[PDB]
Amino acid sequence: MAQASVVANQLIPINTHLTLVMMRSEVVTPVGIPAEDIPRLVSMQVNRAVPLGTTLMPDMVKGYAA
């Protein structure tokens, strides 16, 4: 279990616009947004609070479609 996902590298407050320091890559289960997409995600807004260490899922990012 080689597929990596985007994982919150710090708490991301509700309605924050994502920056690069907020997102790390990690192999986790369930799988969330693919780690390759971290470029695409900068400046997009999360619609709920994302605690440190939680996998970022498609439904947590406003406007995301992969």
Side-chain angles (χ1 to χ4, degrees):
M1 209 289 165
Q3 169 87 330
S5 295
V6 182
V7 172
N9 191 236
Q10 57 165 67
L11 171 80
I12 307 169
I14 188 169
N15 298 135
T16 296
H17 295 279
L18 292 164
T19 63
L20 239 31
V21 306
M22 297 174 191
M23 301 182 273
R24 68 181 178 233
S25 172
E26 191 174 357
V27 175
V28 286
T29 32
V31 300
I33 294 174
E36 60 166 22
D37 292 347
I38 287 163
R40 303 173 53 170
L41 298 176
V42 178
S43 294
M44 294 192 84
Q45 181 175 60
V46 291
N47 58 212
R48 69 192 73 171
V50 192
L52 165 62
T54 68
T55 306
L56 207 49
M57 299 287 171
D59 61 332
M60 296 180 190
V61 179
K62 288 158 70 165
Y64 184 74

Short mmCIF file of all heavy atoms in Angstrom, two decimals:
data_model
loop_
_atom_site.label_atom_id
_atom_site.label_comp_id
_atom_site.label_asym_id
_atom_site.label_seq_id
_atom_site.Cartn_x
_atom_site.Cartn_y
_atom_site.Cartn_z
N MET A 1 0.80 -1.20 0.00
CA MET A 1 0.00 0.00 0.00
C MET A 1 0.91 1.36 0.00
O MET A 1 1.77 1.08 0.10
CB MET A 1 -0.90 0.11 1.24
CG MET A 1 -2.20 0.87 1.04
SD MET A 1 -1.97 2.64 0.84
CE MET A 1 -3.47 3.40 0.20
N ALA A 2 0.83 1.35 -1.63
CA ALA A 2 1.83 2.30 -2.10
C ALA A 2 1.28 3.68 -2.46
O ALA A 2 2.00 4.67 -2.55
CB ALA A 2 2.54 1.74 -3.33
N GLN A 3 -0.01 3.77 -2.67
CA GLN A 3 -0.64 5.03 -3.01
C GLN A 3 -0.64 6.03 -1.85
O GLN A 3 -1.20 5.75 -0.77
CB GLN A 3 -2.01 4.65 -3.44
CG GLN A 3 -2.92 5.82 -3.60
CD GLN A 3 -2.87 6.46 -4.96
OE1 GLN A 3 -1.82 6.43 -5.62
NE2 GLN A 3 -3.95 7.13 -5.35
N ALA A 4 -0.04 7.20 -2.03
CA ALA A 4 -0.04 8.23 -1.00
C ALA A 4 -1.20 9.25 -1.15
O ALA A 4 -1.66 9.55 -2.27
CB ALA A 4 1.30 8.98 -1.04
N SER A 5 -1.68 9.78 -0.02
CA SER A 5 -2.71 10.81 0.05
C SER A 5 -2.21 12.12 0.65
O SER A 5 -1.13 12.18 1.27
CB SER A 5 -3.89 10.30 0.89
OG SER A 5 -4.54 9.19 0.28
N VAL A 6 -3.00 13.19 0.46
CA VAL A 6 -2.69 14.48 1.08
C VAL A 6 -3.16 14.38 2.55
O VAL A 6 -4.32 14.02 2.85
CB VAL A 6 -3.45 15.66 0.38
CG1 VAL A 6 -3.04 17.01 1.06
CG2 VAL A 6 -3.11 15.72 -1.11
N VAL A 7 -2.31 14.72 3.50
CA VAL A 7 -2.60 14.67 4.94
C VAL A 7 -2.32 16.07 5.49
O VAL A 7 -1.33 16.72 5.12
CB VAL A 7 -1.68 13.58 5.62
CG1 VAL A 7 -1.78 13.58 7.13
CG2 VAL A 7 -2.18 12.20 5.18
N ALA A 8 -3.19 16.61 6.35
CA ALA A 8 -3.00 17.90 7.00
C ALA A 8 -1.73 17.93 7.85
O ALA A 8 -1.55 17.11 8.76
CB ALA A 8 -4.19 18.17 7.89
N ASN A 9 -0.82 18.84 7.57
CA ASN A 9 0.45 18.98 8.28
C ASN A 9 0.34 19.91 9.49
O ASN A 9 1.24 20.09 10.31
CB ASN A 9 1.51 19.51 7.29
CG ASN A 9 2.90 19.41 7.90
OD1 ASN A 9 3.64 20.38 8.00
ND2 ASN A 9 3.34 18.27 8.38
N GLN A 10 -0.82 20.53 9.66
CA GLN A 10 -1.12 21.39 10.80
C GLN A 10 -2.64 21.44 10.82
O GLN A 10 -3.27 20.96 9.88
CB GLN A 10 -0.58 22.81 10.58
CG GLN A 10 -1.13 23.43 9.31
CD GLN A 10 -0.94 24.93 9.20
OE1 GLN A 10 0.18 25.45 9.08
NE2 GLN A 10 -2.08 25.64 9.26
N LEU A 11 -3.25 21.98 11.87
CA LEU A 11 -4.68 22.18 11.86
C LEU A 11 -5.02 23.19 10.77
O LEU A 11 -4.39 24.25 10.69
CB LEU A 11 -5.21 22.75 13.21
CG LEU A 11 -6.69 23.19 13.17
CD1 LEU A 11 -7.56 21.98 13.31
CD2 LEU A 11 -6.97 24.18 14.24
N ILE A 12 -6.00 22.92 9.94
CA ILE A 12 -6.44 23.81 8.89
C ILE A 12 -7.84 24.26 9.32
O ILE A 12 -8.77 23.44 9.35
CB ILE A 12 -6.51 23.10 7.53
CG1 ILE A 12 -5.18 22.39 7.18
CG2 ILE A 12 -6.91 24.13 6.49
CD1 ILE A 12 -5.25 21.43 5.95
N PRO A 13 -7.98 25.54 9.74
CA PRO A 13 -9.26 26.08 10.21
C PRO A 13 -10.32 26.05 9.12
O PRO A 13 -9.99 26.16 7.93
CB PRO A 13 -8.93 27.47 10.68
CG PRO A 13 -7.49 27.35 11.11
CD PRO A 13 -6.91 26.50 9.98
N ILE A 14 -11.59 25.87 9.49
CA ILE A 14 -12.68 25.96 8.53
C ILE A 14 -12.55 27.25 7.69
O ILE A 14 -12.12 28.31 8.16
CB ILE A 14 -14.06 25.89 9.31
CG1 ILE A 14 -15.19 25.78 8.26
CG2 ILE A 14 -14.23 27.09 10.24
CD1 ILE A 14 -16.59 25.42 8.81
N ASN A 15 -12.82 27.10 6.40
CA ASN A 15 -12.76 28.18 5.41
C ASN A 15 -11.36 28.76 5.15
O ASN A 15 -11.23 29.80 4.50
CB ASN A 15 -13.75 29.33 5.83
CG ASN A 15 -15.21 28.85 5.84
OD1 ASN A 15 -15.97 29.13 6.77
ND2 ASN A 15 -15.69 28.07 4.87
N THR A 16 -10.29 28.08 5.57
CA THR A 16 -8.93 28.48 5.21
C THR A 16 -8.66 28.12 3.73
O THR A 16 -9.17 27.12 3.21
CB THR A 16 -7.92 27.74 6.16
OG1 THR A 16 -8.20 28.23 7.47
CG2 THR A 16 -6.44 27.97 5.86
N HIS A 17 -7.91 28.99 3.05
CA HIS A 17 -7.39 28.76 1.69
C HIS A 17 -6.07 28.00 1.89
O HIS A 17 -5.18 28.41 2.67
CB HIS A 17 -7.12 30.07 0.99
CG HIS A 17 -8.39 30.88 0.75
ND1 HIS A 17 -9.24 30.62 -0.32
CD2 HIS A 17 -8.93 31.92 1.43
CE1 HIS A 17 -10.24 31.48 -0.26
NE2 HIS A 17 -10.08 32.26 0.78
N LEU A 18 -5.92 26.86 1.22
CA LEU A 18 -4.78 26.00 1.44
C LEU A 18 -3.47 26.59 0.98
O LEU A 18 -3.43 27.22 -0.08
CB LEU A 18 -5.06 24.72 0.73
CG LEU A 18 -6.19 23.87 1.32
CD1 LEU A 18 -6.63 22.82 0.32
CD2 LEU A 18 -5.73 23.23 2.62
N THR A 19 -2.42 26.45 1.79
CA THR A 19 -1.05 26.78 1.36
C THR A 19 -0.23 25.48 1.37
O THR A 19 -0.58 24.43 1.92
CB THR A 19 -0.35 27.82 2.29
OG1 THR A 19 -0.22 27.24 3.59
CG2 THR A 19 -1.11 29.16 2.33
N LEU A 20 0.96 25.53 0.78
CA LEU A 20 1.83 24.38 0.66
C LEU A 20 2.35 23.86 2.00
O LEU A 20 2.54 22.65 2.09
CB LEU A 20 2.96 24.82 -0.32
CG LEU A 20 3.30 24.13 -1.65
CD1 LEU A 20 2.12 23.52 -2.30
CD2 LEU A 20 3.99 25.16 -2.53
N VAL A 21 2.56 24.69 3.04
CA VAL A 21 3.03 24.21 4.33
C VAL A 21 1.99 23.36 5.05
O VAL A 21 2.32 22.65 6.00
CB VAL A 21 3.41 25.32 5.39
CG1 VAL A 21 4.39 26.24 4.73
CG2 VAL A 21 2.25 26.19 5.84
N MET A 22 0.71 23.44 4.63
CA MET A 22 -0.39 22.73 5.27
C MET A 22 -0.57 21.31 4.82
O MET A 22 -1.32 20.57 5.45
CB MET A 22 -1.72 23.43 5.01
CG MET A 22 -1.76 24.83 5.58
SD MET A 22 -3.28 25.64 5.07
CE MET A 22 -2.84 27.26 5.60
N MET A 23 0.11 20.88 3.74
CA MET A 23 -0.17 19.61 3.12
C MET A 23 1.07 18.74 3.02
O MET A 23 2.11 19.14 2.44
CB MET A 23 -0.73 19.82 1.73
CG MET A 23 -2.00 20.64 1.70
SD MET A 23 -2.71 20.85 0.07
CE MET A 23 -1.84 22.28 -0.51
N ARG A 24 0.97 17.55 3.58
CA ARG A 24 2.06 16.59 3.39
C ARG A 24 1.51 15.38 2.64
O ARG A 24 0.31 15.24 2.39
CB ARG A 24 2.65 16.19 4.78
CG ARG A 24 1.80 15.38 5.73
CD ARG A 24 2.58 15.15 7.00
NE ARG A 24 1.80 14.39 7.98
CZ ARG A 24 1.58 14.81 9.26
NH1 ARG A 24 2.07 15.96 9.77
NH2 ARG A 24 0.87 14.04 10.09
N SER A 25 2.41 14.47 2.28
CA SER A 25 2.07 13.25 1.55
C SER A 25 2.35 12.07 2.46
O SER A 25 3.43 11.97 3.06
CB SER A 25 2.93 13.13 0.29
OG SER A 25 2.76 11.87 -0.33
N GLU A 26 1.42 11.14 2.55
CA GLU A 26 1.57 10.01 3.43
C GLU A 26 0.69 8.87 2.96
O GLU A 26 -0.38 9.09 2.40
CB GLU A 26 1.16 10.46 4.78
CG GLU A 26 1.50 9.49 5.87
CD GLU A 26 1.21 10.03 7.27
OE1 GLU A 26 0.77 11.17 7.45
OE2 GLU A 26 1.44 9.27 8.19
N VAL A 27 1.14 7.63 3.14
CA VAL A 27 0.37 6.47 2.74
C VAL A 27 -0.57 6.16 3.90
O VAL A 27 -0.14 5.73 4.98
CB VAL A 27 1.33 5.27 2.43
CG1 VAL A 27 0.53 4.01 2.14
CG2 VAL A 27 2.18 5.56 1.19
N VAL A 28 -1.85 6.41 3.73
CA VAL A 28 -2.84 6.23 4.78
C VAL A 28 -4.05 5.51 4.23
O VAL A 28 -4.24 5.46 3.01
CB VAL A 28 -3.31 7.61 5.38
CG1 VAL A 28 -2.22 8.18 6.26
CG2 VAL A 28 -3.65 8.62 4.26
N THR A 29 -4.86 4.95 5.14
CA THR A 29 -6.12 4.26 4.80
C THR A 29 -7.23 4.86 5.64
O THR A 29 -7.03 5.02 6.85
CB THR A 29 -6.08 2.73 5.10
OG1 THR A 29 -5.24 2.49 6.23
CG2 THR A 29 -5.57 1.99 3.90
N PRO A 30 -8.40 5.28 5.11
CA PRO A 30 -8.78 5.23 3.69
C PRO A 30 -7.98 6.21 2.85
O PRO A 30 -7.44 7.17 3.41
CB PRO A 30 -10.27 5.56 3.68
CG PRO A 30 -10.41 6.51 4.86
CD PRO A 30 -9.50 5.86 5.91
N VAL A 31 -7.90 5.99 1.54
CA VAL A 31 -7.12 6.91 0.73
C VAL A 31 -7.97 8.17 0.46
O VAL A 31 -9.20 8.09 0.34
CB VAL A 31 -6.65 6.23 -0.62
CG1 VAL A 31 -5.81 5.05 -0.30
CG2 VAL A 31 -7.79 5.75 -1.42
N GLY A 32 -7.35 9.33 0.44
CA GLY A 32 -8.03 10.58 0.18
C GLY A 32 -7.55 11.13 -1.14
O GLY A 32 -7.26 10.36 -2.06
N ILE A 33 -7.51 12.45 -1.28
CA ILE A 33 -7.00 13.11 -2.48
C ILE A 33 -5.55 12.61 -2.69
O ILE A 33 -4.74 12.52 -1.75
CB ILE A 33 -7.03 14.65 -2.28
CG1 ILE A 33 -8.50 15.09 -2.17
CG2 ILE A 33 -6.32 15.37 -3.42
CD1 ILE A 33 -8.73 16.57 -1.82
N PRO A 34 -5.20 12.17 -3.90
CA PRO A 34 -3.87 11.71 -4.22
C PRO A 34 -2.85 12.80 -3.93
O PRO A 34 -3.06 13.95 -4.31
CB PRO A 34 -3.94 11.35 -5.67
CG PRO A 34 -5.36 10.97 -5.88
CD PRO A 34 -6.08 12.03 -5.04
N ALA A 35 -1.73 12.42 -3.32
CA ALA A 35 -0.63 13.33 -3.06
C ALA A 35 -0.12 14.10 -4.30
O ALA A 35 0.31 15.26 -4.19
CB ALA A 35 0.51 12.54 -2.48
N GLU A 36 -0.24 13.56 -5.52
CA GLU A 36 0.17 14.25 -6.75
C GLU A 36 -0.59 15.57 -7.03
O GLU A 36 -0.12 16.49 -7.72
CB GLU A 36 -0.04 13.32 -7.96
CG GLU A 36 -1.54 12.98 -8.00
CD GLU A 36 -2.13 12.35 -9.24
OE1 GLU A 36 -1.38 11.74 -10.02
OE2 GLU A 36 -3.36 12.47 -9.39
N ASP A 37 -1.80 15.63 -6.47
CA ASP A 37 -2.64 16.77 -6.62
C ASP A 37 -2.29 17.91 -5.68
O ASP A 37 -2.87 18.98 -5.89
CB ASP A 37 -4.10 16.34 -6.40
CG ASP A 37 -4.70 15.43 -7.48
OD1 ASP A 37 -4.09 15.28 -8.55
OD2 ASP A 37 -5.77 14.85 -7.24
N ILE A 38 -1.38 17.85 -4.69
CA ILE A 38 -1.10 19.01 -3.81
C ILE A 38 -0.89 20.33 -4.57
O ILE A 38 -1.49 21.31 -4.11
CB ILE A 38 0.16 18.74 -2.89
CG1 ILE A 38 -0.23 17.73 -1.79
CG2 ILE A 38 0.65 20.02 -2.21
CD1 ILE A 38 0.95 17.04 -1.08
N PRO A 39 -0.15 20.43 -5.73
CA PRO A 39 -0.13 21.60 -6.62
C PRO A 39 -1.51 22.19 -6.91
O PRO A 39 -1.76 23.38 -6.68
CB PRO A 39 0.54 21.10 -7.90
CG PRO A 39 1.50 20.07 -7.41
CD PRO A 39 0.65 19.36 -6.36
N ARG A 40 -2.44 21.37 -7.39
CA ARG A 40 -3.79 21.80 -7.74
C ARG A 40 -4.59 22.46 -6.61
O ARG A 40 -5.44 23.30 -6.90
CB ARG A 40 -4.60 20.61 -8.21
CG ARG A 40 -4.04 19.83 -9.38
CD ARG A 40 -4.89 18.56 -9.61
NE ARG A 40 -6.33 18.82 -9.75
CZ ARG A 40 -7.19 17.87 -10.15
NH1 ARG A 40 -6.82 16.63 -10.45
NH2 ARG A 40 -8.48 18.17 -10.21
N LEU A 41 -4.32 22.02 -5.37
CA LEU A 41 -5.03 22.42 -4.18
C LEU A 41 -4.67 23.78 -3.60
O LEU A 41 -5.46 24.35 -2.82
CB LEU A 41 -4.81 21.36 -3.11
CG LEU A 41 -5.33 19.97 -3.41
CD1 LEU A 41 -4.94 19.04 -2.28
CD2 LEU A 41 -6.83 20.00 -3.54
N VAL A 42 -3.51 24.35 -3.93
CA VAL A 42 -3.11 25.63 -3.37
C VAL A 42 -4.12 26.69 -3.79
O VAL A 42 -4.55 26.78 -4.94
CB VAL A 42 -1.67 25.96 -3.84
CG1 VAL A 42 -1.15 27.31 -3.38
CG2 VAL A 42 -0.78 24.92 -3.21
N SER A 43 -4.51 27.45 -2.77
CA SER A 43 -5.53 28.50 -2.81
C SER A 43 -6.96 27.98 -2.76
O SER A 43 -7.90 28.78 -2.82
CB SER A 43 -5.43 29.38 -4.06
OG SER A 43 -4.20 30.09 -3.97
N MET A 44 -7.23 26.70 -2.65
CA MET A 44 -8.60 26.26 -2.61
C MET A 44 -9.02 26.28 -1.16
O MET A 44 -8.16 26.24 -0.29
CB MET A 44 -8.69 24.88 -3.24
CG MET A 44 -8.34 25.03 -4.71
SD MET A 44 -8.76 23.51 -5.55
CE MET A 44 -10.47 23.90 -5.79
N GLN A 45 -10.31 26.33 -0.86
CA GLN A 45 -10.79 26.50 0.50
C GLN A 45 -11.40 25.23 1.03
O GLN A 45 -12.11 24.51 0.32
CB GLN A 45 -11.79 27.65 0.46
CG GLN A 45 -12.40 28.01 1.79
CD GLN A 45 -13.28 29.24 1.65
OE1 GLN A 45 -14.25 29.25 0.90
NE2 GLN A 45 -12.99 30.33 2.33
N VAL A 46 -11.07 24.91 2.26
CA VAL A 46 -11.67 23.75 2.90
C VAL A 46 -13.00 24.16 3.50
O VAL A 46 -13.19 25.30 3.96
CB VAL A 46 -10.77 23.16 4.04
CG1 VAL A 46 -9.54 22.56 3.36
CG2 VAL A 46 -10.37 24.19 5.11
N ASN A 47 -13.98 23.26 3.55
CA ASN A 47 -15.29 23.61 4.07
C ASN A 47 -15.55 23.07 5.48
O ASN A 47 -16.69 23.10 5.95
CB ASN A 47 -16.42 23.12 3.11
CG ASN A 47 -16.43 21.63 2.83
OD1 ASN A 47 -16.82 21.20 1.74
ND2 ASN A 47 -15.97 20.75 3.71
N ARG A 48 -14.54 22.57 6.18
CA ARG A 48 -14.66 22.14 7.57
C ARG A 48 -13.27 22.22 8.15
O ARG A 48 -12.29 22.38 7.38
CB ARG A 48 -15.14 20.72 7.68
CG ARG A 48 -14.14 19.69 7.22
CD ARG A 48 -14.85 18.39 7.12
NE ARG A 48 -15.68 18.51 5.94
CZ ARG A 48 -16.34 17.51 5.38
NH1 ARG A 48 -16.33 16.25 5.87
NH2 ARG A 48 -17.03 17.82 4.29
N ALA A 49 -13.18 22.14 9.47
CA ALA A 49 -11.87 22.15 10.12
C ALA A 49 -11.20 20.81 9.80
O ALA A 49 -11.90 19.79 9.76
CB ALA A 49 -11.99 22.27 11.64
N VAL A 50 -9.90 20.80 9.53
CA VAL A 50 -9.16 19.58 9.23
C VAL A 50 -8.07 19.48 10.30
O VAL A 50 -7.08 20.21 10.23
CB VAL A 50 -8.57 19.70 7.80
CG1 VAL A 50 -8.06 18.34 7.36
CG2 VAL A 50 -9.62 20.15 6.79
N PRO A 51 -8.21 18.66 11.35
CA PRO A 51 -7.17 18.44 12.35
C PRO A 51 -5.83 17.94 11.80
O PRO A 51 -5.76 17.29 10.73
CB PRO A 51 -7.79 17.44 13.33
CG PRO A 51 -9.25 17.74 13.20
CD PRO A 51 -9.42 17.93 11.70
N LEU A 52 -4.75 18.22 12.54
CA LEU A 52 -3.42 17.76 12.22
C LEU A 52 -3.46 16.24 12.05
O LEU A 52 -4.08 15.55 12.89
CB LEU A 52 -2.48 18.14 13.33
CG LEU A 52 -1.08 17.50 13.44
CD1 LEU A 52 -0.22 17.79 12.23
CD2 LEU A 52 -0.40 18.07 14.66
N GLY A 53 -2.88 15.75 10.93
CA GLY A 53 -2.80 14.31 10.69
C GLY A 53 -4.02 13.75 9.97
O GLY A 53 -4.02 12.55 9.67
N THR A 54 -5.05 14.53 9.63
CA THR A 54 -6.22 13.93 8.99
C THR A 54 -6.09 13.95 7.47
O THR A 54 -5.50 14.88 6.89
CB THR A 54 -7.52 14.66 9.43
OG1 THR A 54 -7.45 15.93 8.88
CG2 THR A 54 -7.62 14.96 10.90
N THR A 55 -6.58 12.88 6.86
CA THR A 55 -6.55 12.78 5.41
C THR A 55 -7.51 13.75 4.75
O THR A 55 -8.70 13.75 5.06
CB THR A 55 -6.88 11.33 4.98
OG1 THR A 55 -5.95 10.53 5.70
CG2 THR A 55 -6.77 11.04 3.48
N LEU A 56 -7.04 14.56 3.81
CA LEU A 56 -7.92 15.45 3.09
C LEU A 56 -8.73 14.69 2.02
O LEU A 56 -8.21 14.04 1.11
CB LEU A 56 -7.04 16.55 2.51
CG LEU A 56 -7.63 17.92 2.24
CD1 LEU A 56 -8.41 18.46 3.42
CD2 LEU A 56 -6.47 18.82 1.88
N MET A 57 -10.04 14.71 2.14
CA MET A 57 -10.91 13.99 1.23
C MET A 57 -11.52 14.92 0.19
O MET A 57 -11.66 16.11 0.46
CB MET A 57 -12.02 13.33 2.03
CG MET A 57 -11.56 12.32 3.05
SD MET A 57 -11.03 10.83 2.19
CE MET A 57 -10.31 9.96 3.53
N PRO A 58 -11.93 14.47 -1.01
CA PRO A 58 -12.52 15.30 -2.06
C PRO A 58 -13.64 16.22 -1.58
O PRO A 58 -13.71 17.40 -1.95
CB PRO A 58 -13.02 14.32 -3.09
CG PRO A 58 -12.02 13.18 -2.98
CD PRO A 58 -11.81 13.06 -1.47
N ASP A 59 -14.51 15.69 -0.71
CA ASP A 59 -15.66 16.47 -0.22
C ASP A 59 -15.33 17.56 0.80
O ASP A 59 -16.21 18.36 1.15
CB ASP A 59 -16.68 15.50 0.38
CG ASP A 59 -16.16 14.67 1.56
OD1 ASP A 59 -14.98 14.39 1.68
OD2 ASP A 59 -16.98 14.27 2.38
N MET A 60 -14.08 17.64 1.26
CA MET A 60 -13.65 18.64 2.20
C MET A 60 -13.15 19.88 1.51
O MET A 60 -12.97 20.89 2.19
CB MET A 60 -12.55 18.09 3.05
CG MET A 60 -12.93 16.95 3.93
SD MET A 60 -11.44 16.49 4.83
CE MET A 60 -12.06 15.01 5.50
N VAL A 61 -12.98 19.91 0.19
CA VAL A 61 -12.35 21.03 -0.50
C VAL A 61 -13.37 21.64 -1.45
O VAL A 61 -13.88 20.96 -2.35
CB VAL A 61 -11.09 20.53 -1.30
CG1 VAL A 61 -10.49 21.74 -2.03
CG2 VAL A 61 -10.03 19.90 -0.39
N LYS A 62 -13.70 22.91 -1.25
CA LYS A 62 -14.66 23.61 -2.11
C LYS A 62 -14.13 23.78 -3.53
O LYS A 62 -13.01 24.26 -3.77
CB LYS A 62 -14.96 24.96 -1.51
CG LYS A 62 -15.81 24.72 -0.29
CD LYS A 62 -15.77 25.85 0.71
CE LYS A 62 -16.46 27.11 0.27
NZ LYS A 62 -16.65 27.96 1.44
N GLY A 63 -14.92 23.28 -4.47
CA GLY A 63 -14.58 23.40 -5.86
C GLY A 63 -13.74 22.24 -6.31
O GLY A 63 -13.44 22.19 -7.51
N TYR A 64 -13.36 21.26 -5.49
CA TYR A 64 -12.54 20.19 -6.00
C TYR A 64 -13.33 19.15 -6.80
O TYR A 64 -14.42 18.71 -6.43
CB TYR A 64 -11.82 19.47 -4.85
CG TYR A 64 -10.86 18.37 -5.32
CD1 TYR A 64 -9.63 18.66 -5.90
CD2 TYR A 64 -11.24 17.05 -5.12
CE1 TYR A 64 -8.78 17.63 -6.27
CE2 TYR A 64 -10.41 16.03 -5.50
CZ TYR A 64 -9.19 16.33 -6.07
OH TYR A 64 -8.38 15.27 -6.39
N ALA A 65 -12.70 18.73 -7.91
CA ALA A 65 -13.17 17.67 -8.79
C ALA A 65 -11.86 17.15 -9.40
O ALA A 65 -11.02 17.98 -9.78
CB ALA A 65 -14.08 18.26 -9.87
N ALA A 66 -11.61 15.84 -9.42
CA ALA A 66 -10.33 15.28 -9.87
C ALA A 66 -10.42 14.67 -11.27
O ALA A 66 -9.40 14.35 -11.90
CB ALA A 66 -9.90 14.20 -8.92
#
